[PDB]
């Protein structure tokens, strides 16, 4: 659908006014069929569009939606290091220990990317730093050797 394509794009662009105009029952959780099946909320989260994330969360977006690889919008926020988005998604019920297809959790992502505040957020909401992904790696295992502050945080 043409409105769907424009909504997904407005979410990436952070054009909240266009998002407001294009949001319908069906479009608010539509999927990018030719891409990774991301929803508007995956894109807003991944592109750090805080106002769009806030609007979507208030108007019918599913915080738990998975893309083709099993990523929820919290994974996108953590992977690209967007703290405010990660906090909003967690405050709105994102499951902090959710695993994608590869068994990576948001904390695996935040640890690998070395995002202090995001790791702190997830740990405070019960993120399990003992969880192994399919490489047998815990989030602590994914912290870069150069990233001393994150290592210490996760012990």
């Amino acid at each position: 659908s043409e409105a769907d394509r424009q909504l997904l794009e407005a979410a990436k662009a952070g054009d909240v006014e266009t998002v407001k105009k294009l949001c319908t029952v069906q479009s608010v959780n539509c999927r990018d069929i030719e891409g990774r099946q991301s929803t508007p909320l995956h894109f807003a989260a991944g592109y750090n569009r805080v106002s769009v994330v806030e609007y979507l969360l208030q108007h019918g977006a599913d915080v738990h939606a998975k893309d083709k690889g099993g990523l929820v919008p919290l994974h996108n926020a953590c992977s690209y290091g967007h703290y405010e988005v990660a906090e909003l998604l967690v405050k709105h019920g994102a499951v902090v220990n959710v695993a994608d297809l590869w068994k990576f959790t948001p904390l695996h992502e935040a640890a690998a990317k070395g995002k202090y505040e995001i790791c702190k957020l997830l740990l405070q909401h019960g993120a399990d730093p003992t969880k192994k992904n399919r490489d047998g790696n815990t989030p602590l295992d994914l912290v870069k050797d150069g990233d001393t502050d994150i290592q210490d945080l996760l012990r």
Binding site: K12, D32, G35, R36, S38, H42, F43, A45, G46, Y47, N48, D67, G69, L71, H75, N76, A77, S79, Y80, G81, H82, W102, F104, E109
Partner: peptide, 12 residues
């Protein structure tokens, strides 16, 4: 296949 991070962009 390589594991993909999902749709999004880095902050500056």
């Amino acid at each position: 296949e390589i594991r993909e991070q999902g749709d999004g962009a880095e902050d500056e």
